[PDB]
RNA sequence: AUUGAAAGUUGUAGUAUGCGGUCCUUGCGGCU
């Protein structure tokens, strides 16, 4: 499918390669927010919604796997972050507890995008 | 041929000491 990236000249070709899995990217929010694909869905109509972006991939499952594959590459750095976060908690003698999502969770659904 | 002649309001001196832009606030509702 035809995809266009309205960013600076040299970034546009790299963003193309990232979304096409021709080049590895290690930051999820970066590729999502600053390298938004504008997908030529039909005619001269370009779209930047997740519904249109999904067409860059074989299927919904392929799209999901890509996102999480990018996400997971921060694991090593995130572990140190989470450990310092726990150290932060205990320095303030915090009441620490863990809970699990019982259903789907979406915080910040309405952030302008 | 005068109450006249002569005489630097100058010298020294930190607008400074104390003081959290903070507190209260579910990016959500379902509409156009």
From TrEMBL:
Question: Where on the tree of life does the source sit, at the highest rank?
Answer: Archaea
Provide the protein name.
Answer: CRISPR type III-associated protein domain-containing protein
Q: Which organism does this record belong to?
A: Archaeoglobus fulgidus (strain ATCC 49558 / DSM 4304 / JCM 9628 / NBRC 100126 / VC-16)
């Amino acid at each position: 499918v035809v995809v266009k990236y309205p960013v600076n000249s040299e970034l546009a070709n790299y963003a193309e390669k990232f979304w096409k899995k021709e080049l590895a990217i290690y930051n999820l929010s970066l590729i999502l927010n600053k390298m938004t694909p504008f997908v030529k869905r039909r005619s001269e109509s370009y779209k930047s919604s997740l519904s249109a972006v999904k067409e860059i991939f074989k299927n919904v499952d392929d799209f999901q796997n890509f996102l999480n594959s990018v996400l997971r590459r921060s694991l090593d750095e995130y572990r140190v972050f989470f450990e310092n976060y726990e150290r932060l908690f205990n320095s303030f003698s915090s009441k620490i507890f863990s809970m699990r999502t019982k259903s789907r969770l979406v915080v910040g659904l309405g952030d302008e995008s």
